[PDB]
Design a protein around this ligand. Structure first.
Ligand SMILES: CCC(=O)n1c(=O)n(CCOc2ccccc2Oc2cccc3cc(C#N)ccc23)c2ccccc21
Ligand SMILES: [Mg+2]
Ligand SMILES: [Mg+2]
Lengths: 549, 401
């Protein structure tokens, strides 16, 4: 048990003293269980009886949930002890584990209780077994208490230092550490490996760390952190999408949770319409009525989850490869693999990063997400097989005002291909009618109008209810598209509307912009020009006076 | 051999910044570098009782790998301790940058402050919690290091400044800026004398600038043989923009040439009154702006626009429409947007150090994660400015073009 390991010095937060949380009375039966557990733990050196001078206390409890166990509420001591180097939050991803002929799982028993606790800090762990009479069996810890803030980081650290020696004289045995577990892999003879396991066991037993014997060592399949690890494959654990008549905010959060979890291996998971439902969200209790698109999305997810799927492990010897496919409006899906149909993992990307975007922008963002994830999981970036042609992407990233990093990729011709649905003109169009557009709205009555005046002498005003100056300026552009031929010059004074159209979106949150896009696609040539308002520039002044009167 | 006590600003704890994931290659390069630095006593491994952290990066300044520490957060949290600049440095004809950061590793760091220099070499795929170190000596990149070393630096440079009184020497973090009005060959000789002087006194040293040729680029108006309605509308819109900066600009005669409701491609003869108005507006743009004064208490801000074909415009200001400096960088293309932006940022920051002695806060036209992924691939400087990520496309591009 207790080890000859060096201790970590620990301090309380500056200006803070130890906890003095008084103890609550306990059932005579719980007082008895605590007395026999504490005498067994004092017997092992884990705790020690203390004099009456210790002014600190931490409440102690006993439950059986037979096997009575002692639980200590360290909340107050934790609030008072210094921060530590954050223990491992992220866990390894199954798709980044390197395949190994042999894998062993060691559970370290009573992990925390095997590591000593800084001497100067032990007085602050004091606890008291209650006396029915009130009397008072004061104790204090000599090892890492369970539930204390420092135990995970200090046990972690200690185990790293303990393992260093064996690792050095065994540089061919991979030893993952994670909580009170160790996962040991090797490419040796089941025999050699076993022997090396038994060595590590006895080495760890020399530092007070008990570990499991073959007859007690866990066996594959390994149910670990929501995964299923087989010798040659991995997948996620059973996902049960509930069936309910009514859905609360909380039910939807759990639902997109499980679906986000399933998307790392099940290709084609879509979650966007469902998470659209949680926009203002509010209380997790509010019933949120489902949209038809959220119903279809959920229904397509259940179809996908009907078939079992698995991922493979990593061979640092083979290339890393990523493919991306469009999965509907704004929804994308990707696979990462080394062998053409044996996926390391999958994922999705359905962010608009704005009210409006276009396919090429979203694909580039998808590639970005894949790049970041590849560096996390494998320490490198993959090769990209993408359904877009060089001319499409080169035209976009050259004309795009934002700096972009486009990897080296290979066009894979697998419809739907990513394309530019339209391209605005760069120079005014000869022979095309020139529409001077403007809109206006009353910021109080919310009423408004959109209108044009052209160079052929045509004028028009359409009325609008419940609108804003921004929306009418888009409606004026939409109106000029509606009433023009296949080639049209449009002149607006709206920096707002110009910015939206110049960005060349092909999908939007607003149906008006979606309508404008349909018109832009049906046109052959559109040129959009801008002029400062209220400067008496010809054509612009006529529509202003028109939509103003 | 004796340490200089270092403090953090009152009521402020050490840095706790996330270490960014790195490729296997950059991690391997950091382990090699840190193993050697640990053998030399410069860094020591730390235990779990140290909660602080500062990010580290593997860069190249360039065939061998170099370690770069992002002490931006620690510099903010100790600045009282490290917070003169000579106004003549921008006037000099040639200015050479010397990397003198290796001299910091001669000086031990205050033992009570070392824990704040903690950093982490990350693992791949969270296999290991990461390798932890702190600094035993003054680290490169910490603003406290040139401040503690300052007396030794004055002492070593005193003979050389005695010999060369007209030569300006400014230090900013790990670099020395050395300005002269001499001819280029005499300048590089004076630079080499200063190198050898530093080298024979135990300061190891591995950039020629010419601020005498910098300027706030004047607004430029098009010159065309034939103007369309569209060209006049662009012209009027750009002049209308500049009139927020230059008050005397008028567009009445130019916009009069468009009266009516005209086809955008219709050719408009540039009449006399309009041509005079345009000629007058070209003259007022040649003269500079007024009231644009630098304030040392306010943060410098840099905006940058992609112009295409390798060109990038930038403006440095502290208050909107009060540019202290404007500029246009070009790239003689193996190039890409990120390479050109990374380079422009370093050029702008160097220009800003020379002129005002501090780094500006950048508004970068790039997606955050793309910048965070690739910025080290072309970063050669030893400092790192603040930055944020923006869009602002509208017409800013064509007006500064
Ligand atoms: C190939 C045979 C086999 O059973 N497994 C296998 O190859 N992998 C992939 C490589 O994974 C490891 C490499 C070195 C150390 C341990 C490895 O296994 C694990 C890594 C990380 C976490 C683990 C958690 C558990 C649990 N519970 C078990 C093993 C882990 C395998 C991965 C898992 C299980 C079997 C194999
Ligand atoms: Mg208007
Ligand atoms: Mg770090």
């Amino acid at each position: 048990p207790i080890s000859p390991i060096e201790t970590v010095p620990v301090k309380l937060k500056p200006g803070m003293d130890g906890p003095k949380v008084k103890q609550w009375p306990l059932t005579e039966e719980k007082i008895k269980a605590l007395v026999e557990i504490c005498t067994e733990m004092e017997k092992e050196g884990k705790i020690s009886k203390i004099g009456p001078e210790n002014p600190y206390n931490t409440p102690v409890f006993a439950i059986k949930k037979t096997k009575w166990r002692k639980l200590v509420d360290f909340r107050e001591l934790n609030k008072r002890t210094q921060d530590f180097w954050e223990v491992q939050l992220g866990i390894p991803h199954p798709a980044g584990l390197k395949k190994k002929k042999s894998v062993t799982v060691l559970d370290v028993g009573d992990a925390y209780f095997s590591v000593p606790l800084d001497e100067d800090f032990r007085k602050y762990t004091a606890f008291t077994i209650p006396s029915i009479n009130n009397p008072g069996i004061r104790y204090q810890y000599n090892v890492l208490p369970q539930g204390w803030k420092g135990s995970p980081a200090i046990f972690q650290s200690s185990m790293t230092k303990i393992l260093e020696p064996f690792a050095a004289q065994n540089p061919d045995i991979v030893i993952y550490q994670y909580m009170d577990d160790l996962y040991v892999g090797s490419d040796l003879e089941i025999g050699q490996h076993r022997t090396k396991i038994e060595e590590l066991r006895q080495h760890l037993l020399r530092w007070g760390l008990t570990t499991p014997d073959k007859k007690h060592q866990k066996e594959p399949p390994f149910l670990w952190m929501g995964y299923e690890l087989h010798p040659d494959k991995w997948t996620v654990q059973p996902i049960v999408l509930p069936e309910k008549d009514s859905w609360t905010v909380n039910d939807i959060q759990k639902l997109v949770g499980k679906l986000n979890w399933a998307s790392q291996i099940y290709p084609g998971i879509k979650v966007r319409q469902l998470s659209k439902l949680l926009r203002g969200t509010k209380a997790l209790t509010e019933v949120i009525p489902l949209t038809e698109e959220a119903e279809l999305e959920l229904a397509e997810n259940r179809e996908i989850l009907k078939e079992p799927v698995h991922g493979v492990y990593y061979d640092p010897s083979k290339d890393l490869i990523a493919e991306i496919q469009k999965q509907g409006q704004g929804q994308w899906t990707y696979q990462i693999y080394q062998e053409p149909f044996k996926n390391l993992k999958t994922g999705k990307y359905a962010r608009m990063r704005g009210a409006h975007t276009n396919d090429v922008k979203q694909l580039t963002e998808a590639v970005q997400k894949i790049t970041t994830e590849s560096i996390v999981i494998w320490g490198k970036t993959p090769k990209f097989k993408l359904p877009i042609q060089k001319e499409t992407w080169e035209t976009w990233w050259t004309e795009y005002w934002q700096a972009t990093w486009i990897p080296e990729w290979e066009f894979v011709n697998t419809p739907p291909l990513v394309k530019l649905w339209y391209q605005l003109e760069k120079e005014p169009i000869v022979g095309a009618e020139t529409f001077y557009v403007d809109g206006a709205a009353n910021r109080e009555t919310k009423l408004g109008k959109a209108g044009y005046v052209t160079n052929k002498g045509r004028q028009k005003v359409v009325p609008l209810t419940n609108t804003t100056n921004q929306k009418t300026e888009l409606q004026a552009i939409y109106l000029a598209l509606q009433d023009s031929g296949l080639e049209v010059n449009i002149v607006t004074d709206s920096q707002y509307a110009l910015g939206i159209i110049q960005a060349q979106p092909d999908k939007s949150e607003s149906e008006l912009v979606n309508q404008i896009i349909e018109q832009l696609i049906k046109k052959e040539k559109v040129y959009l020009a801008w002029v400062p308002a209220h400067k008496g520039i010809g054509g612009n002044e006529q529509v202003d006076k028109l939509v103003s009167a | 051999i004796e340490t200089v006590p270092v403090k953090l600003k009152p009521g402020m704890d050490g840095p706790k910044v996330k270490q960014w994931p790195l490729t296997e290659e950059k991690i391997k390069a950091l382990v090699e570098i840190c193993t050697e630095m640990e053998k030399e006593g410069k860094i020591s491994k730390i235990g779990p009782e140290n909660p602080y952290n500062t990010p580290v990066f593997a860069i190249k300044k360039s065939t061998k790998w170099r370690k770069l520490v992002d002490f931006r957060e620690l510099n903010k949290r100790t600045q009282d301790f490290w917070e003169p600049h000579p106004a003549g440095l921008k006037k000099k004809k040639s200015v050479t940058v010397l990397d003198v950061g290796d001299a910091y590793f001669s000086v031990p760091l205050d033992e009570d402050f070392r824990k704040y220099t903690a950093f982490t070499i990350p693992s791949i795929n969270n296999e290991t919690p990461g390798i932890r170190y702190q600094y035993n000596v003054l680290p490169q990149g910490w603003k406290g290091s040139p401040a503690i070393f300052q007396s030794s630096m004055t002492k070593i440079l005193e003979p050389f400044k005695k010999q060369n009184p007209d030569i300006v020497i400014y230090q900013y973090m790990d670099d020395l800026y050395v300005g002269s009005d001499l001819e280029i060959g005499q300048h590089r000789t004076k630079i080499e004398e200063l190198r050898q002087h530093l080298l024979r006194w135990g300061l190891t040293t591995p950039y020629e600038l010419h601020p005498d040729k910098w300027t706030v680029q004047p607004i430029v108006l098009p010159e065309k043989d034939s103007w369309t309605v569209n060209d006049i509308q662009k012209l009027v819109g750009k002049l209308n923009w500049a009139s927020q900066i230059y008050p005397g600009i008028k567009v009445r005669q130019l916009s009069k040439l468009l009266r009516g409701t005209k086809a955008l491609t219709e050719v408009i003869p540039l009449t006399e009154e309009a041509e005079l108005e345009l000629a007058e507006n070209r003259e007022i743009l040649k003269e500079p702006v007024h009231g644009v004064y630098y304030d040392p208490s306010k943060d410098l801000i840099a905006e940058i626009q992609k112009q295409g074909q390798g060109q990038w415009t930038y403006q440095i200001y502290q208050e909107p429409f009060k540019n202290l400096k404007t500029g246009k960088y070009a790239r003689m293309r193996h190039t890409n947007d990120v390479k050109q932006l990374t380079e422009a940022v370093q050029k702008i920051t160097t220009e800003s150090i020379v002129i005002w002695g501090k780094t500006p806060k950048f508004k970068l036209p790039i997606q955050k994660e793309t910048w965070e992924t690739w910025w080290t691939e072309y970063w050669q400087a030893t400092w790192i400015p603040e930055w944020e990520f923006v869009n602002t496309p509208p017409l800013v591009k064509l007006w500064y073009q």
